[PDB]
Amino acid sequence: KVFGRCELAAAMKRHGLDNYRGYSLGNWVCAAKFESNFNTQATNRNTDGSTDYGILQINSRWWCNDGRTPGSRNLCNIPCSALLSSDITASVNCAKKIVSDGNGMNAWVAWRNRCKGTDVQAWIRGCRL
């Protein structure tokens, strides 16, 4: 599924991500924009052999199981395929764990490089939320 901007904002709010760990909804929408361009089916292989999955490009190195990432963990206790669903619940649940791990949203390199410090409220501007 490819979400619209406000549509994704609403879905994230519905699943309790707005101001989770102090990160406003615009931060989460911005991260999703630059991680996946709002596409739930996005997958990208990393140089180390792990793969990133879904709207928030969650890595099989630590967070989900894809059966082909040696030495990795599965801390969200989910198959990585679950992070590709049209329903964003599994991605949201796992993102909540990731952002609680110590470094906040810096865990998402695209958030640090493209969202952090910017006018992230622009991402929810005009949205009926």
Q: Which residues are annotated as a binding site?
A: 101
Q: What token pair was written down for 35?
A: 């991680």
By the 8 A CB rule, do 94 and 77 touch?
no
Q: What are the residues whose beta carbons fall under 8 Å from the beta carbon of 114, sequence distance 6 or more?
A: 30, 34
Give the residue with the Cβ less far from Na ion, 36 or 65. 65
**Size of the residue set binding Cl ion (CB under 5 A):** 8
Among 24, 43, 81, 93, binds Cl ion (CB under 5 A): 24
Instruction: Please identify the residue of the shown chain whose CB is closest to the bound Na ion.
Output: 72
Is residue 72 a contact point for Na ion (CB under 5 A)?
yes
Is 52 assigned a catalytic role?
Answer: yes
**Touching Cl ion, residues 65-84 (CB under 5 A):** 69
Q: Residues at the annotated binding site for substrate? A: 101
Q: What are the residues whose beta carbons fall under 8 Å from the beta carbon of 83, sequence distance 6 or more?
A: 53, 54, 55, 56, 58, 64, 90, 91, 94
Write out the residues near Na ion by the rule CB under 5 A. Answer: 60, 65, 69, 72, 74
